[PDB]
Ligand SMILES: *[C@@H]1O[C@H](CO)[C@@H](O)[C@H](O)[C@H]1NC(C)=O
Ligand SMILES: *[C@@H]1O[C@H](CO)[C@@H](O)[C@H](O)[C@H]1NC(C)=O
């Protein structure tokens with residue numbers, strides 16, 4: 306996270322050149338990630354001049370709300386890219402029907418019915434004698450549902 | 457000092473419910489009737505997985521340290537329970553010559569009369585912790601019997617571990633890749649086990 310001028314916002318890019326990309330914040334040529342920037346003229350800029358931001362021996366930027374769009378201060382955050390995964394949206398669960406279920410670790414087609422099994426608290430899936438899944442634990446509601454294959 | 461590890465050191469290999477079935481699995485387990493080192497903070501290695509068993513009366517042992525150098529050179533695991541909450545940190549800590557308890561960080565989590573068994577293994581950067589608590593009345597050595605250790609903590613540390621030490625009687629075992637036949641009851645717990653590399657009778661049973 307850094308604060309730069311509006312005209313220098315384009316310098317935060319792979320394979321870019323300029324004062325910021327040369328001496329302040331240099332990006333790799335094969336960098337993987339996203340760059341998000343937004344204007345901060347009503348937050349960081351001051352009427353008397355906000356010289357708290359310095360760039361390269363170093364010079365300050367005259368951030369003012371009465372300046373132009375290119376002279377307005379911009380807050381730029383670069384997210385450089387396993388523990389940080391994307392979110393997984395869940396759907397509603399319908400019982401007693403032939404469905405294509407998708408739980409945490411396995412996918413399959415079957416009929417989800419209420420079970421009478423007593424799973425251990427650390428167990429998520431059940432297995433039969435012939436190494437097939439017969440019951441699973443719902444990841445949201447602590448209940449055990451039998452997986453009957455469709456007719 | 458060495459004691460006899462008769463039938464202990466068996467944990468759940470996965471999170472799969474099994475009922476009324478004898479399941480054969482291959483994983484790292486403590487050998488049956490093997491020698492485990494008896495202690496009353498020495499430097500001990502982390503070769504292939506370590507079984508830890510401790511007997512307590514006044515909560516002497518507080519935690520463990522896992523790593524390679526543990527001298528502020530690389531990332532090392534610090535799991536310390538300071539009597540109210542279990543604290544796990546993987547920072548490059550600077551440890552003393554003889555660490556003890558009186559009377560760059562990438563992850564941080566804050567949570568004889570008794571026997572506490574532990575299993576520590578690090579496979580593919582994941583630190584698997586299994587544990588089981590039971591009351592005992594015995595002093596000389598570990599009680600004879602069978603019990604299963606359930607998994608509680610899974611740490612995606614991604615840190616190489618070759619040396620561990622114990623922070624404060626306790627026993628240290630080692631895990632080797634042998635096949636086991638696990639007996640599952642109707643309630644899904646492990647009630648008996650057979651070490652397939654113990655004796656020809658166990659081989660026949662397996
Ligand atoms: C998820 O949140 C719901 C609240 O809508 C709660 O009932 C459920 O137990 C939660 N599940 C887990 C695994 O925390
Ligand atoms: C180690 O175990 C063997 C059995 O394989 C036994 O004969 C030997 O006495 C044990 N050593 C010690 C020091 O207990």
Ligand SMILES: *[C@@H]1O[C@H](CO)[C@@H](O)[C@H](O)[C@H]1NC(C)=O
Nearest residue numbers: 536537538539540541543566
């Ligand atoms: C245990 O240590 C953690 C930090 O390692 C600290 O936040 C906590 O307050 C400590 N608990 C006690 C009871 O001292």
Ligand SMILES: *[C@@H]1O[C@H](CO)[C@@H](O)[C@H](O)[C@H]1NC(C)=O
Nearest residue numbers: 528529530547548549560561
């Ligand atoms: C943290 O690691 C960096 C290397 O990325 C090193 O320069 C720094 O000295 C380390 N700091 C500590 C406190 O170990």
Ligand SMILES: *[C@@H]1O[C@H](CO)[C@@H](O)[C@H](O)[C@H]1NC(C)=O
Nearest residue numbers: 530531581613614615616617
């Ligand atoms: C662990 O050791 C391997 C070499 O076998 C090495 O490639 C890897 O980077 C090491 N991991 C850490 C976290 O140092």
Ligand SMILES: *[C@@H]1O[C@H](CO)[C@@H](O)[C@H](O)[C@H]1NC(C)=O
Nearest residue numbers: 423640641642643644645647
């Ligand atoms: C399973 O647990 C119940 C208590 O909920 C107990 O009554 C029953 O005997 C147990 N069965 C087995 C085989 O352990």
